[PDB]
Amino acid sequence: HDANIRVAIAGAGGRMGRQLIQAALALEGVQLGAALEREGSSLLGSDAGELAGAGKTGVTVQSSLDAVKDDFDVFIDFTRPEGTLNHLAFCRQHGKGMVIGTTGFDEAGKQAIRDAAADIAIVFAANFSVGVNVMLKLLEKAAKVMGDYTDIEIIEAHHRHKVDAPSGTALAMGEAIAHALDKDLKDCAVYSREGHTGERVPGTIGFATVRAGDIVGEHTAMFADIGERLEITHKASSRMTFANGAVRSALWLSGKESGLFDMRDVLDLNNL
Amino acid sequence: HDANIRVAIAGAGGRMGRQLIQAALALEGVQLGAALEREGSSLLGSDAGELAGAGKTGVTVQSSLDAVKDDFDVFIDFTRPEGTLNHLAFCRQHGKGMVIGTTGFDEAGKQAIRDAAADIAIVFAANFSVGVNVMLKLLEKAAKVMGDYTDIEIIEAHHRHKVDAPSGTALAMGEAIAHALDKDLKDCAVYSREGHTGERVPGTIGFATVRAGDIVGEHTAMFADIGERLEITHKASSRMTFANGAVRSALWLSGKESGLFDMRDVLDLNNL
Amino acid sequence: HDANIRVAIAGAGGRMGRQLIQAALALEGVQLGAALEREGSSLLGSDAGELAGAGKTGVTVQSSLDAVKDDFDVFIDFTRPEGTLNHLAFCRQHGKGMVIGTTGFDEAGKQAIRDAAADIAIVFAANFSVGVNVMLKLLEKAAKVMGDYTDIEIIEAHHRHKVDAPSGTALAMGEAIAHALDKDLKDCAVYSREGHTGERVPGTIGFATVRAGDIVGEHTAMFADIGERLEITHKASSRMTFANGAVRSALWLSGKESGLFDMRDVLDLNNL
Amino acid sequence: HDANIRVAIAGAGGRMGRQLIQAALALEGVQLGAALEREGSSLLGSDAGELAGAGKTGVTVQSSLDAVKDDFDVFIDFTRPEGTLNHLAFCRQHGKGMVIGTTGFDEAGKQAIRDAAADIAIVFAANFSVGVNVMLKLLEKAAKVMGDYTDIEIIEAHHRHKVDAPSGTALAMGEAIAHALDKDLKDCAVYSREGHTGERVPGTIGFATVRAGDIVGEHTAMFADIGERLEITHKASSRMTFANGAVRSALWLSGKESGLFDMRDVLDLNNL
């Protein structure tokens, strides 16, 4: 954006890097610090933010943390677990704040992350969508209220390549509701309905899963009664959703250097 | 309505009879002929159409076909298979046209019906919803066109007491599409998606089934591609949908006395 | 239901009375106390709850408060402002708790109500839908969070007889959001979009209004960004929604005799 | 794809060119002929289809029609009216078949196009979405059937930059329906509903317009009655929809060299 908190975007020609750039650009109060990328990169040294279209930006993609360690405040990393660990150890060093959206660490990789937080302020999360995280919070408000009277159904659609049903956001949704009811998902979940199934059992949570086309991700929780239903739906149209989520966090980091946070923290979902 | 085709509504204090009354009333060109009902009825002799609210109508519920055989042209029957057969034999007799929406005949009961048609004009159908029947026709237009490129998914929701999944309209939908593609439903249907399921197989038809609350019936067929999807949804809010369907047919009957028709005939779905 | 709090339902053959009966019946912990109705009633003395179908219930519709003042604890009133005032003065008298859903009082009628509360515990509200009231609460959580980044749109559909656009629940929704943002609805509302309108102004709230058929009421608030949108939709299928809302309140009343409450109170929306 | 009809994609690094490439690639029976682009291009001579990701394709972007006039059969043009005319005159010359999706010609530019068709087979259309074109056809089937009984409402949502309300697809929808009813859109359209509006007038068509976020385009026509509604919705997720539409047409062209067609022709909407 150009503003009071400057940022460097790790995996610059990543599907993630491309979109974080636009967001960095876009969002008030952040400014594009640096735009690193792999050494073997073609996009190296040259650029700016022109995968985020956005023509000439004046910050040029790179390959050394040292080259630019001076050109940003918060390190946004959507990379591969390998890089993050390098990034990690560097940021701890120069006390650089990070925002890790990289996934797939083993226990050792997480621990490293928990550890750095000791010295470094870190937002580390598996879903940076702001809509998704709010929704999960809302679902749990709703359940406290209607949960016991209502039939609660969860319906998700994704593209034709998604490989496990239900999706994890969907389970996540099942679980917030379930937990709001002191109950247990595994106890009341029903993922299939085929043939004669008999009338719906009270208190169970049903899942319905649609797979088609190019659908990025659509999740609705229905709280149904006699005479009404309440529905809370999230639709993702692009990966941009994660992007603004991380950048927003990048901005939230400014001013902290305690340890370890997530989107509840950034979002304050917990006082909502 | 008061108009050029007069009607008698068999099971007068039926959930069906109540709503057909309002429709008879409502719909231009039909007029409420008679309003029969069971002998043991409380509503007998007394009434009018005042289950259809509608205050005073001047036609009084009854119990004899002879009592009123002169007071209507088309016999609308949503009753029990037993009554319909009595009704049947009477209407054949006086050449009364019928509209049977009664369900649950065995082979012998159907045959009787096929037989009467010889002398009597009959609309006999298992779903009198006009929306549903149009939809089925549209689905099949759509499939000719997009069917081969697209992922085709069927999603139905019903109340918490519905006992087999998918619903029959849903299978019906599966089958029109399937048949439009020269294909066979049983060959490409998928009714469940649980756990690891792998990427979606091309050409299969997936079903997703929601059961909650008081939902009368909601059915959507999704034809999804990369970059778009086309959806054709029907929602039933009340049993009125069947009602106007039969009354409409009652009117369509006027002027025929050939045999045996259904909603494709009434609706001309076949030249659509 | 038969249980620990007994109830009398004012306008017994009202569209409201019929449905409250079923709810009283239905809902755990309440029991049908009495079923009053107008003197000139046909349904008088005779009945039970058999407008709520529900065959024989053992409580017989009436016309005197004295006749039954002993047969119930909480007075549920969905009547006409005239009756409520009579009802009012009686309940104050015998310290009967009320639940007023009657609408259309002038200032004097409200004041009477405020006044009785002094001695009598009263739930008095203009919308007893539980879904609607929760939703309004959720909308305001959502706005605190996404309100500033997002385009917020409100879309309502009602039947073809609804006479002012937007509906009042919709304005209500506009206003909770607006107020969550410290903002003012009248300042940022846009109710029409026709012709050339130019790009959407930031921070405005747009309303889109659908009128067709028999739609009881459907209200969705969309919080849209780049890459996602979050939607919170309420659908009413019947007047039953209000019914369970009042009965639920009837139960909430048990144990109070302070003054004056509403659905936030009953629902505790305020600690949600 | 690699197959029996070879194609060249005019504006190669266009938002359109990028997506047509993937489609050309994707779709069975077409093969990427050539990938032209402007002279001043950076992408020149070099490439393949690697804006369509898709790594190495073996066909290299260019700048001369002569350079490659031998390397393709059908000319797909999503360019600027200026280029199309050059393209035009060349294709007429070598009897190259075209598919023009370029927009913004004046009368003279169209005429040129009408004229070339004399010698050249051309698909020329303002909306290449297959879903949209089918939908329009379906809407008109539906209206013949339900049009007179039903309340018909049109609801479209687009992103926050769309500048005229309703969208043109929406009017287009209004007009197919209107015309199916022998009626006239301008006579029965209602684009706004604000304040007291009174009950809905029969036979009118209402439009409701949502503007928010990044919504590519969502259009639903609702045919509502008492007791049901039928909805036909199209959702665009990307510009890919147009892309497959043109490529599909490119394939449909194979074997013609008569004049002038559109998507009804390609799609055979007219015998549907």
Ligand SMILES: NC(=O)c1ccc[n+]([C@@H]2O[C@H](COP(=O)([O-])OP(=O)(O)OC[C@H]3O[C@@H](n4cnc5c(O)ncnc54)[C@H](O)[C@@H]3O)[C@@H](O)[C@H]2O)c1
């Ligand atoms: N947390 C969330 O909200 C969320 C959302 C989306 C993606 N992700 C995660 O984001 C990460 C990025 O995914 P993507 O789809 O953007 O991937 P992808 O397009 O494959 O790009 C990888 C990026 O990282 C760079 N890279 C790979 N290894 C590197 C190394 O050792 N050092 C430096 N740069 C390296 C690449 O050159 C490129 O910039 C993944 O770990 C993915 O699972 C997380």
Ligand SMILES: NC(=O)c1ccc[n+]([C@@H]2O[C@H](COP(=O)([O-])OP(=O)(O)OC[C@H]3O[C@@H](n4cnc5c(O)ncnc54)[C@H](O)[C@@H]3O)[C@@H](O)[C@H]2O)c1
């Ligand atoms: N075809 C469709 O579109 C469709 C739709 C809805 C219901 N149905 C069928 O409609 C029929 C009516 O259902 P309903 O829910 O209206 O039932 P219900 O409310 O139980 O009412 C039965 C009605 O038939 C009368 N009745 C029963 N046996 C009779 C007899 O022997 N002679 C004369 N009257 C007799 C009753 O007194 C009452 O009027 C059923 O067979 C149902 O399966 C069909």
Ligand SMILES: NC(=O)c1ccc[n+]([C@@H]2O[C@H](COP(=O)([O-])OP(=O)(O)OC[C@H]3O[C@@H](n4cnc5c(O)ncnc54)[C@H](O)[C@@H]3O)[C@@H](O)[C@H]2O)c1
């Ligand atoms: N607060 C909400 O959530 C909400 C929702 C729906 C309806 N309402 C209100 O509920 C009330 C009832 O509407 P309804 O549609 O049920 O009306 P309606 O069907 O007209 O019935 C009126 C009922 O009150 C009885 N009645 C009329 N005047 C009376 C009197 O002086 N004393 C005793 N009984 C009397 C009638 O005989 C019948 O029981 C109305 O004031 C309406 O505006 C409120």
Ligand SMILES: NC(=O)c1ccc[n+]([C@@H]2O[C@H](COP(=O)([O-])OP(=O)(O)OC[C@H]3O[C@@H](n4cnc5c(O)ncnc54)[C@H](O)[C@@H]3O)[C@@H](O)[C@H]2O)c1
């Ligand atoms: N018919 C439809 O279904 C439909 C749909 C989308 C876009 N369009 C039309 O597609 C066309 C392309 O839009 P776009 O968004 O892809 O535009 P845009 O990204 O601006 O790209 C223009 C493309 O044409 C090339 N170009 C411009 N002038 C040229 C010339 O004189 N000779 C050769 N190449 C030339 C550019 O270098 C680039 O390849 C526009 O006319 C647009 O209105 C039509």
